[PDB]
Design an enzyme around this catalytic site. Structure first.
Site, PDB file in Angstrom:
ATOM      1  N   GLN F  10      28.273  65.200  63.677  1.00 54.94           N
ATOM      2  CA  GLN F  10      29.352  64.166  64.470  1.00 54.94           C
ATOM      3  C   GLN F  10      30.714  64.382  64.298  1.00 54.94           C
ATOM      4  O   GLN F  10      31.596  64.757  65.172  1.00 54.94           O
ATOM      5  CB  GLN F  10      28.827  62.771  64.433  1.00 54.94           C
ATOM      6  CG  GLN F  10      29.941  61.867  65.185  1.00 54.94           C
ATOM      7  CD  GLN F  10      29.792  62.183  66.931  1.00 54.94           C
ATOM      8  OE1 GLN F  10      30.855  62.595  67.358  1.00 54.94           O
ATOM      9  NE2 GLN F  10      28.772  61.436  67.417  1.00 54.94           N
ATOM     10  N   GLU F  70      21.606  65.321  67.527  1.00 51.47           N
ATOM     11  CA  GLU F  70      22.103  64.353  68.676  1.00 51.47           C
ATOM     12  C   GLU F  70      22.754  65.332  69.867  1.00 51.47           C
ATOM     13  O   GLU F  70      23.674  65.946  69.554  1.00 51.47           O
ATOM     14  CB  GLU F  70      22.717  63.221  68.349  1.00 51.47           C
ATOM     15  CG  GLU F  70      24.101  63.163  67.501  1.00 51.47           C
ATOM     16  CD  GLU F  70      24.642  62.070  66.940  1.00 51.47           C
ATOM     17  OE1 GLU F  70      24.498  61.150  67.602  1.00 51.47           O
ATOM     18  OE2 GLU F  70      25.168  62.226  65.843  1.00 51.47           O
ATOM     19  N   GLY F 143      24.129  61.994  58.353  1.00 51.37           N
ATOM     20  CA  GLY F 143      22.523  62.521  58.022  1.00 51.37           C
ATOM     21  C   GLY F 143      22.616  63.991  58.474  1.00 51.37           C
ATOM     22  O   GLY F 143      22.185  64.840  57.767  1.00 51.37           O
ATOM     23  N   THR F 144      22.902  64.250  59.544  1.00 50.26           N
ATOM     24  CA  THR F 144      22.909  65.428  60.341  1.00 50.26           C
ATOM     25  C   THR F 144      23.902  66.473  59.443  1.00 50.26           C
ATOM     26  O   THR F 144      23.574  67.741  58.989  1.00 50.26           O
ATOM     27  CB  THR F 144      23.373  65.604  61.686  1.00 50.26           C
ATOM     28  OG1 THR F 144      24.670  64.915  61.835  1.00 50.26           O
ATOM     29  CG2 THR F 144      22.267  64.838  62.465  1.00 50.26           C
ATOM     30  N   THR F 178      31.768  52.857  56.899  1.00 46.23           N
ATOM     31  CA  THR F 178      30.947  52.754  58.196  1.00 46.23           C
ATOM     32  C   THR F 178      29.724  52.873  58.089  1.00 46.23           C
ATOM     33  O   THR F 178      28.585  52.198  58.996  1.00 46.23           O
ATOM     34  CB  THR F 178      31.318  53.366  59.420  1.00 46.23           C
ATOM     35  OG1 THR F 178      30.886  52.848  60.487  1.00 46.23           O
ATOM     36  CG2 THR F 178      31.190  54.843  59.395  1.00 46.23           C
ATOM     37  N   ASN F 205      39.074  59.420  54.473  1.00 47.89           N
ATOM     38  CA  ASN F 205      39.465  58.746  55.742  1.00 47.89           C
ATOM     39  C   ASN F 205      40.640  57.627  55.413  1.00 47.89           C
ATOM     40  O   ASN F 205      41.606  57.703  56.223  1.00 47.89           O
ATOM     41  CB  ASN F 205      38.260  58.104  56.543  1.00 47.89           C
ATOM     42  CG  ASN F 205      37.564  59.089  57.610  1.00 47.89           C
ATOM     43  OD1 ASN F 205      38.415  59.553  58.392  1.00 47.89           O
ATOM     44  ND2 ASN F 205      36.411  59.373  57.333  1.00 47.89           N
ATOM     45  N   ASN F 227      41.838  63.596  63.645  1.00 50.37           N
ATOM     46  CA  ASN F 227      41.353  64.987  63.978  1.00 50.37           C
ATOM     47  C   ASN F 227      42.661  65.807  64.279  1.00 50.37           C
ATOM     48  O   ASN F 227      42.446  67.116  64.118  1.00 50.37           O
ATOM     49  CB  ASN F 227      40.136  65.030  64.989  1.00 50.37           C
ATOM     50  CG  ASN F 227      39.003  64.180  64.636  1.00 50.37           C
ATOM     51  OD1 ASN F 227      38.970  63.950  63.244  1.00 50.37           O
ATOM     52  ND2 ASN F 227      38.169  63.619  65.583  1.00 50.37           N
ATOM     53  N   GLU F 253      42.085  84.587  48.429  1.00 52.73           N
ATOM     54  CA  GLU F 253      43.037  84.292  47.160  1.00 52.73           C
ATOM     55  C   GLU F 253      42.707  83.008  46.598  1.00 52.73           C
ATOM     56  O   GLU F 253      42.611  82.808  45.504  1.00 52.73           O
ATOM     57  CB  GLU F 253      44.450  84.211  47.784  1.00 52.73           C
ATOM     58  CG  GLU F 253      44.744  85.109  48.607  1.00 52.73           C
ATOM     59  CD  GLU F 253      44.959  86.864  47.939  1.00 52.73           C
ATOM     60  OE1 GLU F 253      45.172  86.586  46.508  1.00 52.73           O
ATOM     61  OE2 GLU F 253      44.773  87.803  48.599  1.00 52.73           O
TER      62      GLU F 253
HETATM   63  N1  LIG Z   1      37.539  62.459  60.249  1.00 51.81           N
HETATM   64  C1  LIG Z   1      36.652  62.199  60.897  1.00 51.81           C
HETATM   65  N2  LIG Z   1      35.510  61.640  60.161  1.00 51.81           N
HETATM   66  C2  LIG Z   1      34.585  61.213  61.375  1.00 51.81           C
HETATM   67  C3  LIG Z   1      34.582  61.129  62.478  1.00 51.81           C
HETATM   68  N3  LIG Z   1      33.410  60.545  63.042  1.00 51.81           N
HETATM   69  C4  LIG Z   1      32.744  60.374  62.296  1.00 51.81           C
HETATM   70  N4  LIG Z   1      33.569  60.377  60.948  1.00 51.81           N
HETATM   71  C5  LIG Z   1      32.778  60.176  59.454  1.00 51.81           C
HETATM   72  O1  LIG Z   1      31.268  60.733  59.375  1.00 51.81           O
HETATM   73  C6  LIG Z   1      30.709  59.567  58.775  1.00 51.81           C
HETATM   74  C7  LIG Z   1      29.349  59.691  59.343  1.00 51.81           C
HETATM   75  O2  LIG Z   1      28.624  60.742  59.628  1.00 51.81           O
HETATM   76  P1  LIG Z   1      28.748  61.126  61.313  1.00 51.81           P
HETATM   77  O3  LIG Z   1      29.661  62.005  61.367  1.00 51.81           O
HETATM   78  O4  LIG Z   1      29.414  59.664  61.987  1.00 51.81           O
HETATM   79  O5  LIG Z   1      27.284  61.228  61.786  1.00 51.81           O
HETATM   80  P2  LIG Z   1      26.747  62.437  61.227  1.00 51.81           P
HETATM   81  O6  LIG Z   1      27.394  63.302  60.197  1.00 51.81           O
HETATM   82  O7  LIG Z   1      26.527  63.666  62.368  1.00 51.81           O
HETATM   83  O8  LIG Z   1      25.251  62.105  61.125  1.00 51.81           O
HETATM   84  P3  LIG Z   1      24.211  61.400  61.892  1.00 51.81           P
HETATM   85  O9  LIG Z   1      24.745  60.244  62.584  1.00 51.81           O
HETATM   86  O10 LIG Z   1      22.871  61.124  61.456  1.00 51.81           O
HETATM   87  O11 LIG Z   1      24.088  62.329  63.123  1.00 51.81           O
HETATM   88  C8  LIG Z   1      31.460  58.373  58.818  1.00 51.81           C
HETATM   89  O12 LIG Z   1      31.502  57.680  57.614  1.00 51.81           O
HETATM   90  C9  LIG Z   1      32.996  58.775  59.363  1.00 51.81           C
HETATM   91  O13 LIG Z   1      33.841  58.830  58.058  1.00 51.81           O
HETATM   92  C10 LIG Z   1      35.934  61.749  63.253  1.00 51.81           C
HETATM   93  O14 LIG Z   1      35.991  61.585  64.272  1.00 51.81           O
HETATM   94  N5  LIG Z   1      36.909  62.256  62.178  1.00 51.81           N
HETATM   95 MG   LIG Z   2      26.009  61.757  63.275  1.00 56.92          MG
END
Ligand SMILES: Nc1nc2c(ncn2[C@@H]2O[C@H](COP(=O)(O)OP(=O)(O)OP(=O)(O)O)[C@@H](O)[C@H]2O)c(=O)[nH]1
Ligand SMILES: [Mg+2]
Ligand SMILES: Nc1nc2c(ncn2[C@@H]2O[C@H](COP(=O)(O)OP(=O)(O)OP(=O)(O)O)[C@@H](O)[C@H]2O)c(=O)[nH]1
Ligand SMILES: Nc1nc2c(ncn2[C@@H]2O[C@H](COP(=O)(O)OP(=O)(O)O)[C@@H](O)[C@H]2O)c(=O)[nH]1
Ligand SMILES: [Mg+2]
Lengths: 156, 426, 376, 95, 427, 436
Positions: F10, F70, F143-144, F178, F205, F227, F253
């Site tokens: 995500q 997802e 997770g993903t 989170t 973050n 981002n 490098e």
């Molecule tokens: N820098 C940044 N971090 C993000 C963003 N969205 C989610 N995260 C981070 O992603 C972490 C959780 O994983 P996610 O990316 O939300 O979801 P995922 O890694 O795809 O895992 P699943 O939810 O099971 O599919 C959170 O702790 C957030 O800190 C974003 O837009 N920018």
């Molecule tokens: Mg996710």
């Protein structure tokens, strides 16, 4: 009408049907495509004036490869005036600066002959850079100049 | 100059031919009203192969239409490019055969084949230098297979020196339309091994899975399949119609692909084939055409070439190309998977190039593989034929028409002999 | 991030091959760049030249970058095309024999006000072609007398190109009446050098088409009307590409007209081969490098050719050559400040003007420039 | 393998179940998604044989070569010698 | 002095279409037929202000022929001198040799007879063809035979296009090449091979054109032909004629097969790069990376070489370079024959074509050698003919046209005999 | 020289949605995939060639694959503004999420999706010619991005191995978090992130929150702003490949200059000047102050204290109008200062780099147009403190066997838990040993 303005046309009349690709895009190139096939070795003796090997030769302006016998030839023209009549600072060899024709009368004789004949004897052969192109022999019998009976004209 | 006389049999042949004459009319730039409306003068010089000037630029096709039920004739004339066929080429019965090889080959053929022979003759001497005949029909139906095969026999008897291509669809197990598919398939292929010059096998399942995977259409109606088969037909005949760097006529392909007189059942492919949503991914270069061309999922027959050995192959390229990349790509695909090619023939691949891509394309290709994997399809039919003949099912509608049992024994023996020869050369 | 992309061809003298280069000019960084169309390879990294003048390109000229006389043949991008075609506008701005006695001042006014003299000629018309011009007013007795008056003196006919050229030029002219413009705005040229409504001096064009046909009449594909030339006793003067670029041509034309009478004039580009052949007298006279530099400078852009005459009618070469001063721009400046080569001559090869030096060849050179160059 | 299309029955693809992506691309290009019959049935006798079927089966909007651009290789490679102007670099006549 | 050229097949007339472009450009003949005496060997002057080539294009498919008829050179070629059958031979020797030949070759030689009669000082014939096909191989051999029975003593320079080992376009070119060579032996006087892989490697290596087509091949083949005809066309310091190849390069009546080379193959940027001289181009004409036939002469021994020079060539330099070659021991000559060189010089430098990739060179060398690597080539083709014939593949096509397996077996043993000959000579 | 980028999770593809927006506006590419018809692309312009492959005529497809399970965020991209940039066969999407479950993402759904990822990345590398390496984008908390991200890295390493893999990961912050099980996901990700990637850059973050709060004085940020400046850091680090500089570096490098031991590869990143439109007018930004600005913890991307650590090495990208004299003077001043200290055993700890093209602005963005910018990529022992911090909260939840029954319900066991725990313990010992 716009052949180079827009590429698709560039593709259209490219022979192959596609335009030349970018250098990074081409898969094979660089060290492989080198045309080093035109290569030779010149065997030079310690004091050989001219090469019989058949390699390319420098111009007569450059002082190498039997330059002397050439400079001293009758159908040879130099784009610049001889050192004895030069006049300025800037590119005076130390020897040339200190050793000049002592007699103004001798300078006069020299300048008369040089100006009347050798200064404008030929000018078409002079290129843009000022380096005269070698006369290129045309025809089997063409002779560059008299070599055997050298004193064709006497007394002057 | 060289003249191709088109023949369409039955429902499948009539509708495929309708799309075919649509594509050809497109590629020579004639409108469905029958006059020339193209722009390039590359097209007026080679319309004598596929049309005849009548009066005032009325270019009418040199095609013969053949069936037994007015439903197909109405579908021919109802669509666009319908009123350009000559009304005397609507030679046409009235009773209907209906999935009976005996009816389509002994009763209805008896009084239809003579009139269509009058038409095919008239349309043959109407031109000067025949190249051959091109026939599109089916094998499951009755009025296409039986009637068409009887015509094939009749014309190969009279004109024995002209080429003959047959585009015939063959049945499939998972998609099985009629019930007597083996009874018609066996007898037709038995006659085709003796009379047809080369047969380019089609089938519906492979086309069906192609519109699934490569085209990603949601509902591939018949008009799409007919356009694909028609695209292949045009890709075949492109050599006579357009100038090229290395022209390859129909006979040139037959000698480069037929090593033995009974050994002439090909499988066909076509490139490029990509979806509407992915037309932009791909560049049009020789590698991207070739990786798709030798893909097994691009065959228009349900015979995995990885389950056998290629005997010969041919590639007809269209569009301005670079022959070096064409040939080195053929050499690479011949050397890498070297086990899938036969051993006692070097340079299995014939190639050719013509300078005009199909309209809407930039650079296309057509693949014709004479592989040994086609015995899989024939064994798929023979086991079903033996299963039916074991207990004489549906036999009397054939026996009561003049046909006897030794016809079925002859058909089964020949097909079994043919698959034995394919297995020998594998 | 701004690009002005042109297509410009260069033929190496050594290989005699003409190839097209894509030439990008970045006016923000005063920076230049070019790529090779045929091989799709960079030719310049993106070097910052800033030697060139953003007024000097205009799709016609020869730009010099690292000693490559390359002329801009076509507009590379539609965006560049629109932006430039918005600037370039064609106007004819011929003068009348009244202020011809002070043409250089007027021309200097033009170049300082902001313009580009793309074409220029000086000639006197007889009454026939005088009536050919101003043809659309053939019915008016007023204009029926103008078509005679205009054919008396020596007339300068010169084109002008600039953004809003028709408007700006017709403005700087001033209304057809001279005196009421003297009363309203004396800065207008027709008010500055005008006698009456009929003896105005600063004619121009008013509509794009009525400028097109007039320029076609004066310059034309192969037309040469009303040639004014003298046989002997008159010398030549070549205003080099330097001064026509920096507009100083106005500063020199009056500077020479105050003492001599210009008889003919013209502004025309000239080829290397044609340029080199013209200076043949100087081949064996000067060192090869400097003669080369002179010939290439002469073929480095547009140039003006004044056919200078004398008042008494005796001879022009001797007095005019002293007027030019020493050939060296720098040497002349220290002890001959009145000469024009000292006044606005830049450097050795970038000197101000060119003047014939042997009284034997004055007629030769002038008749070459005014018969053999145009008719070829 | 098998497409799953139980949604977007109407001649519009609002929801993103199934293979909406190529359906959507086809919808912009021809105005008919899935079978040409469905659109006419919604618009409302006749069948669905009358289909354009060129832009559905074979067409590449970007790489299409117009018949103006149709030229054989011999034509494109043996131009008239005197006025050939289809090449960037050519030895110019330089008397 | 005059020479006529005949072009057979799809390859023959496409190479000819490049060759006659070069000729028109070299003598400055406009493509409509008139100039704006050295041309007399190729273009006859008809009437006043009109030149018409001494050539015949012929083929059995009318496509490429009337493609020429509607090409750029419409007024230049005689309307009649383009012979065109109505249907192809289709990669079939027997079809090209017995079926359609019998009605096309009579009109062909009835045309070439009045070409020769309008000529006065005919040197010989010069034939371009490809043996891998049916049209070029079949009636090309048939016409070669009937020209031999008609004139015979006139030399026939044959520039053939053989199949390469791995890069290949057809399938039955083994059969067609074999049945062609059985007559290519006894009727051609000097045969010069022109492969396709070798020229692909040349075009990708030297001229660095990454996507080469047949035209680029045809263009530099035209360069070679014009380079070895330049001696008759223009006056030079040391002229050679068509009779010299017959004498100075064919030591035995059944060994006439040549390796060709051309130097310098250089694009428009590398001419500025390199300082072209006689020594290095004479060297460069000998490496395998510059031969027009894909084989390695390191495996063989040279018998005799000929070297045409064009442009600014001084004889002291060419003599010196070949001296360094003879003393170089990387390559080896056969001892049976000690003085195995022949030079020839012409004055004019080779010309460029607008759109060609070859730059204007000062001097160029065309080497035509004789070796035994050709004996390696025929064996390499022999092996793959045996692999296919053992299973009686594709035979029914030829027999159906009317022939038998006897001509297969005797042509196979013929090539076997020639293999024995090159082995005996190389000793 | 070409490098491709895969986005797993995500967070990854949202970062990419900001990154590729930055790239196309850097090269003047309209979102539909081609340059404005008005201007003409230079014939020999290969600047965009490193990411974009020009298919046919007038089209540039990025060398990247967004992939996730997802479909929500993926098909958001497919219907967003950049529909025409990515046509839809690279955007790999599953059918059901791994849902913050490392086992579910590495074993259950990975087995169905990873083969499709591999045989797509194969033909992308086959279109590629001079492949420098890969760079991945994932947040190890989820997770993903954690599970199948580890599986994808494993199978990429067995496919190529020798090619460098730049891993820009997002670790969970200590206090701002989170998710609940992201300790579990982070330890299990690191167990493979150790032995697969070559060069792995951490982006926290909470640090970025504090940056946009302090320097950009945005009181409330969304993920768009985070981002956006992440994309600035990535673009600043790849600008050495895209644009010719006075002193350029490639991907290889950092492989040499920054990784002294084959297991210590975790780089703290930072960027300067992160400045708004108003602070900029008031404050001059020269080289000396931005070099200073790159070293305080108030401008770093991972919430840690570099004062507690000793620098192993540092790397400095300079973009824009930078001459080498004053960057040389600035690193001189930094080296003589005693507020920060390098590790004793390496005397030379810097890797300078200068590029000509300045960073550009994004429309609607908050960062103003600056003449120059600096991207610092360093290596210290503060990371060794970070891993211990995550290790503690991992052991606390593991002591009661909380949430373990989900992983075992997927099919894993206690062995991989114990071995990942001791793996991080050995990792801790290695940082403590090297820091001495
Ligand atoms: N820098 C940044 N971090 C993000 C963003 N969205 C989610 N995260 C981070 O992603 C972490 C959780 O994983 P996610 O990316 O939300 O979801 P995922 O890694 O795809 O895992 P699943 O939810 O099971 O599919 C959170 O702790 C957030 O800190 C974003 O837009 N920018
Ligand atoms: Mg996710
Ligand atoms: N180098 C070169 N080879 C060519 C050219 N044209 C054809 N060939 C060769 O010709 C071989 C096949 O014979 P073709 O010339 O195509 O046809 P053909 O010889 O006329 O025989 P048919 O096809 O029966 O008419 C191919 O292997 C090509 O290598 C050409 O323009 N240049
Ligand atoms: N692809 C395609 N197949 C067709 C078409 N029409 C019929 N067929 C196939 O032909 C077979 C039945 O042929 P049939 O109509 O009975 O032949 P006929 O009755 O003798 O004319 C079925 O398996 C169909 O799949 C068509 O328009 N397109
Ligand atoms: Mg042929």
């Amino acid at each position: 009408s716009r052949l180079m303005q827009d590429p698709k046309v560039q593709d259209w009349a490219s022979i192959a049907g596609t335009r030349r690709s970018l250098a990074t895009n081409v898969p094979d190139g660089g060290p492989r495509v080198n045309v080093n096939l035109l290569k030779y070795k010149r065997d030079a003796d310690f004091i050989s004036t001219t090469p019989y090997d058949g390699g390319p030769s420098y111009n007569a302006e450059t002082c190498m490869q039997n330059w002397a016998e050439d400079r001293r030839d009758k159908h040879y023209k130099s784009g610049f005036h001889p050192k004895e009549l030069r006049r300025s600072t800037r590119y005076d060899s130390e020897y040339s600066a200190r050793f000049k024709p002592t007699s103004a009368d001798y300078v006069g004789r020299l300048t008369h002959t040089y100006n009347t004949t050798s200064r404008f004897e030929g000018l078409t052969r002079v290129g843009t850079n000022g380096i005269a192109a070698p006369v290129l022999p045309k025809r089997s019998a063409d002779t560059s100049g008299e070599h055997v009976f050298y004193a064709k004209d006497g007394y002057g | 100059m060289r003249e191709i006389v088109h023949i369409q049999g039955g429902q499948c042949g009539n509708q495929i031919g309708a799309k075919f004459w649509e594509v050809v009319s497109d590629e020579h730039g004639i409108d469905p009203t029958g006059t020339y409306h193209g722009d390039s003068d590359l097209q007026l010089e080679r319309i004598n192969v596929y049309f005849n000037e009548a009066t005032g630029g009325r270019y009418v096709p040199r095609a013969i239409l053949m069936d037994l039920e007015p439903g197909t004739m109405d579908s021919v004339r109802s669509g666009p490019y319908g009123q350009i066929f000559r009304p005397d080429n609507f030679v046409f019965g009235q009773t209907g055969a209906g999935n009976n090889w005996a009816k389509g080959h002994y009763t209805e053929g008896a009084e239809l084949i003579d009139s269509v022979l009058d038409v095919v003759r008239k349309e043959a001497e109407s031109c000067d230098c025949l190249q051959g005949f091109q026939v599109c029909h089916s094998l499951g139906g009755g009025t296409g297979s039986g009637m068409g095969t009887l015509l094939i026999s009749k014309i190969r008897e009279e004109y024995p020196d002209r080429m003959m291509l047959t585009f015939s669809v063959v049945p499939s197990p998972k998609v099985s339309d009629t019930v007597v598919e083996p009874y018609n398939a066996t007898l037709s292929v038995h006659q085709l091994v003796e009379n047809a010059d080369e047969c380019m096998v089609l089938d519906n399942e492979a086309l069906y899975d192609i519109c699934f995977r490569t085209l990603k259409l949601t509902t591939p109606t018949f008009g799409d399949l007919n356009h694909l088969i028609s695209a292949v037909m045009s890709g075949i005949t492109c050599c006579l119609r357009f100038p090229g760097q290395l022209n390859a006529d129909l006979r040139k392909l037959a000698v480069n692909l037929i090593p033995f007189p009974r050994l002439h059942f090909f499988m066909v492919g076509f490139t490029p084939l990509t979806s509407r949503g992915s037309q932009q991914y791909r560049a049009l270069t020789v590698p991207e055409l070739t990786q798709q061309m030798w893909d097994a999922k691009n065959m228009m027959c349900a015979a995995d070439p990885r389950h056998g050995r290629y005997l010969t192959a041919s590639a007809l390229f269209r569009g301005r190309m670079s022959t070096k990349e064409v040939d080195e790509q053929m050499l690479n695909v011949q050397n890498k998977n070297s086990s899938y090619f036969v051993e006692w023939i070097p340079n299995n691949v014939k190639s050719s190039v013509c300078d005009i891509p199909p309209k809407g394309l930039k650079m296309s290709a057509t693949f014709i593989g004479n592989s040994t994997a086609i015995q899989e399809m024939f064994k798929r039919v023979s086991e079903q034929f033996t299963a039916m003949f074991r207990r004489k099912a549906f036999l009397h509608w054939y026996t009561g028409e003049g046909m006897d049992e030794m016809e079925f024994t002859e058909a089964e023996s020949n097909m079994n002999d043919l698959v034995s020869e394919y297995q020998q050369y594998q | 991030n701004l690009r002005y992309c042109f297509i410009s061809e260069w033929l190496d003298p050594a290989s005699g091959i003409l190839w097209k280069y894509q030439l990008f000019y970045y006016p923000e960084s005063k920076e230049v760049e070019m790529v090779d169309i045929k091989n799709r390879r960079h030719f310049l990294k993106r070097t910052k030249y800033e030697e060139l003048k953003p007024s000097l390109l205009f799709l016609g000229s020869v730009v010099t970058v690292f000693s490559r006389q390359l002329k801009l043949t076509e507009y590379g991008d539609e965006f560049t095309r629109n932006r430039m075609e918005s600037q370039s506008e064609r106007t004819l701005a011929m003068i009348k024999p009244d202020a011809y006695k002070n043409m250089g001042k007027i021309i200097n006014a033009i170049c300082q006000s902001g313009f580009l003299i793309s074409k220029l000629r000086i000639g006197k018309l007889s009454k026939e072609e005088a009536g050919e011009f101003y043809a659309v007013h053939a019915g008016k007795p007023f204009v029926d007398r103008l078509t005679d008056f205009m054919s008396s003196g020596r007339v300068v006919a010169m084109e002008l190109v600039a953004p809003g050229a028709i408007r700006k030029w017709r403005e700087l002219i001033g209304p057809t009446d001279s005196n009421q413009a003297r009363a309203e705005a004396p800065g207008s040229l027709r008010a500055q050098f005008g006698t009456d409504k009929t003896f105005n001096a600063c004619h121009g064009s008013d509509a794009p088409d009525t400028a097109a046909e007039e320029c076609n009449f004066w310059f034309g594909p192969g037309r040469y009307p009303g040639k004014c030339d003298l046989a002997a006793g008159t010398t030549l003067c070549l205003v080099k590409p330097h001064l026509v670029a920096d507009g100083a041509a106005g500063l020199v034309i009056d500077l020479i007209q105050e003492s001599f009478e210009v008889t003919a004039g013209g502004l025309y580009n000239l080829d290397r081969n044609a340029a080199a052949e013209f200076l043949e007298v100087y081949k064996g006279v000067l060192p090869a490098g400097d003669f080369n530099s002179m010939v290439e400078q002469l073929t480095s852009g547009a140039c003006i050719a004044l056919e200078v005459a004398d008042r008494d009618g005796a001879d022009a070469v001797e007095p005019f050559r002293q007027l030019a001063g020493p050939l060296d721009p720098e040497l002349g400046r220290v002890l001959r400040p009145a000469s024009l080569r000292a006044r606005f001559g830049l450097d050795a090869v970038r000197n101000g003007v060119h003047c014939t030096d042997l009284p034997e060849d004055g007629v030769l050179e002038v008749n070459y420039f005014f018969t053999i160059l145009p008719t070829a | 393998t098998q497409p799953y299309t139980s949604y977007n029955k109407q001649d519009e693809v609002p929801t993103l179940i199934g293979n909406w992506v190529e359906e959507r691309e086809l919808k912009e290009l021809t105005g008919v998604t899935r079978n040409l019959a469905a659109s006419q049935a919604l618009k409302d006798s006749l069948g669905d044989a009358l289909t354009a079927t060129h832009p559905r089966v074979i067409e590449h909007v970007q790489a299409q070569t117009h018949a103006a651009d149709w030229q054989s290789t011999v034509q494109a490679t043996y131009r008239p010698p005197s006025d050939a102007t289809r090449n960037a670099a050519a030895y110019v006549n330089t008397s | 002095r005059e020479v006529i050229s005949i072009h057979i097949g799809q390859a023959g007339i496409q190479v000819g279409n490049a060759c006659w472009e070069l000729y028109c450009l070299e003598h400055g003949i406009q493509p409509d037929g008139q100039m704006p005496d050295a041309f007399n060997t190729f273009f006859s002057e008809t009437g006043a202000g009109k030149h018409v080539p001494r050539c015949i294009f012929l083929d059995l498919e009318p496509t490429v022929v009337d493609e020429v008829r509607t090409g750029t050179y419409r007024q230049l070629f005689h309307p009649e001198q383009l012979i065109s059958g109505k249907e192809d031979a289709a990669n079939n020797f027997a079809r090209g040799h017995y079926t359609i030949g019998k009605e096309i070759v009579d009109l062909a030689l009835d045309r070439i007879r009045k070409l020769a009669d309008n000529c006065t000082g005919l040197q010989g014939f010069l034939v371009f063809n490809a043996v891998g096909g049916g049209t070029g191989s079949g009636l090309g051999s048939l016409l070669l035979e009937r020209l031999s029975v008609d004139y015979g003593k006139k030399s026939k320079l044959g520039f053939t296009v053989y199949p390469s080992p791995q890069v290949s376009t057809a399938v039955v070119e083994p059969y067609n090449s074999v049945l062609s060579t059985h007559s290519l032996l006894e009727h051609t006087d000097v045969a010069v091979m022109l492969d396709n892989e070798a020229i692909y490697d040349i075009c990708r290596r030297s001229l660095d054109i990454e996507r080469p087509t047949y035209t680029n091949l045809n263009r530099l083949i035209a360069q070679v032909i014009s380079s070895l005809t330049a001696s008759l066309r223009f006056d030079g310091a040391l002229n050679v004629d068509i009779t010299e190849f017959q004498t100075n390069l064919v030591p035995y009546p059944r060994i006439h097969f040549m390796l060709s080379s051309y130097a310098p193959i250089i694009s428009a940027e590398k001419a500025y790069h390199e300082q072209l001289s006689v020594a290095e181009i004479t060297n460069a004409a000998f490496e395998p990376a510059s031969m027009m036939v894909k084989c390695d002469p390191r495996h063989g021994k040279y018998m005799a070489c000929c070297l045409m020079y064009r442009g600014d060539v001084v004889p002291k330099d060419v003599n010196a370079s070949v001296a360094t070659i003879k003393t170089k021991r990387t390559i080896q000559f056969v001892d049976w024959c000690p003085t195995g060189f022949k030079c020839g010089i012409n004055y004019q430098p080779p010309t460029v074509v607008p759109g060609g990739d070859l730059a204007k060179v000062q001097r160029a060398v065309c080497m035509i050698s004789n070796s035994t690597a050709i004996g390696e080539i025929f064996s390499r083709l022999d092996h793959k003919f045996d692999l296919m014939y053992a299973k009686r593949a594709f035979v029914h096509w030829y027999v159906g046209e009317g022939m038998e397996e006897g001509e297969f077996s005797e042509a196979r043993e013929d090539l076997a005999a020639l293999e024995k000959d090159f082995e005996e000579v190389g000793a």
